[PDB]
């Protein structure tokens, strides 16, 4: 994998800019992997897949804080609360590396 962290998958709520823990939270094992480049989040407690995001070259990625990043592909929005700044940095690096490999021209 390009990155693997245990993080809380996030989703937008009905406020103008706020985020909630998807499904009420708990940790998921979130992997960025490689051709398709995927962000995959599997909830630890029951192995439910709660994040399945195929990466595209044009994504928008927002490091809102050192432990909260979100990204957008088209109008689809995904985010993570990380357990540490180190994890967030590793995840961001992995996304960037995946996009480097995806991009071919």
Domain boundaries of the chain, sorted by first residue? 1-105
Q: Hey, is 48 helix, strand or coil?
A: coil
Q: Hey, is 93 helix, strand or coil?
A: helix
Which residues touch 87 (CB under 8 Å, ≥6 apart)?
5, 6, 7, 67
User: Do 86 and 69 meet the contact criterion of CB atoms below 8 Å apart?
Assistant: no
Which residues touch 83 (CB under 8 Å, ≥6 apart)?
5, 6, 7, 27, 67
Q: Which of 63, 51, 49 is nearest to 96 (CA)?
A: 63
Token duo for residue 96: 């960037």
**In 1-84, which ranges are E strands?**
3-12, 19-21, 28-33, 38-43, 49-54, 60-65, 68-73, 76-82
Spell out the alpha helix ranges (H) of the chain: 85-102
Kindly provide the resolution of this structure in angstroms, with one decimal.
1.1
User: Do 55 and 99 meet the contact criterion of CB atoms below 8 Å apart?
Assistant: yes
- CATH fold, domain 1-105, is PH-domain like (2.30.29)
């Amino acid at each position: 994998s390009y990155a693997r962290v245990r993080a809380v998958v996030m989703t937008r709520d009905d406020s103008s800019g706020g985020w909630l823990q998807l499904g009420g939270g708990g940790l998921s094992s979130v992997t960025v992997s490689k051709t398709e480049f995927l962000v995959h989040g599997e909830r630890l407690r029951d192995k439910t897949v709660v994040l399945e995001c195929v990466l595209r070259r044009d994504l928008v990625y927002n490091k809102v804080t050192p432990t909260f990043h979100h990204w957008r592909i088209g109008d689809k929005k995904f985010g993570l609360t990380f357990q540490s700044p180190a994890d967030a940095r590793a995840f961001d690096r992995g996304i960037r590396r995946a996009i480097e490999d995806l991009s071919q021209g």
